[PDB]
Ligand binder design. Sequence first.
Ligand SMILES: Cc1cc2nc3c(=O)[nH]c(=O)nc-3n(C[C@H](O)[C@H](O)[C@H](O)COP(=O)(O)O)c2cc1C
Length: 144
Amino acid sequence: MKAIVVYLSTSGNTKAMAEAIGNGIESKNVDVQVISFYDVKLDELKEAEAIAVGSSTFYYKMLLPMEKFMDETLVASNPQGKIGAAFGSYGWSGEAPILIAEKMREMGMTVMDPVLRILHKPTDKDLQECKRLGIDIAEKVKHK
Ligand SMILES: Cc1cc2nc3c(=O)[nH]c(=O)nc-3n(C[C@H](O)[C@H](O)[C@H](O)COP(=O)(O)O)c2cc1C
C-alpha cells in the first residue's frame, strides 16, 4: 500500500517536516513519496491510501497555490474515505494546518490526529514528532 506526503514550503521548514513524516512512513514498510504540491500528479493522489498535506501559514491562511491544489486537484482525486493528515510550519498564528484539516474533512477524508504544526525551523526533536506522525499514518494504512 501507498502514502503520499504533499507540501508547500517557502523557506524549507514545512518541507523538512514532510521529509521526516515520510521517513516515519518508510520505517514501517509502507511505500511513500514526499513531493511538492507543484510536482504531484492527479494519478498519484488517486493511487494513495493516505494523503498528508502540509503548508506554511502566510497572513493567516495556507498559501494560495496550496488552496487551489486542495480545492481543485485533491477534490478531483476522489479522496472520500481515505486517510488524511495535515501539517505545517508557522510563525505565530498557525492557521494553515487547521484549515487544511477542515478542508480534508469537508471532502470526506478521515483526518488523523494529531494535526501537526511546528513553530519556525523544526529542531531535531520537532522532526521526531514528524516521524511519529508518519509512523502513525503507516500503521493506520496497514490496519485498513
Ligand atoms: C510574509 C510572511 C507572512 C507570514 N505570515 C504568517 C502568519 O500570518 N501566521 C503565522 O503563523 N506565520 C506567518 N509567517 C511565518 C511562516 O509561516 C514561518 O516562517 C514558517 O516557518 C515558514 O515555513 P516554510 O519554510 O515551510 O514556508 C509569515 C512569514 C512570512 C515571510
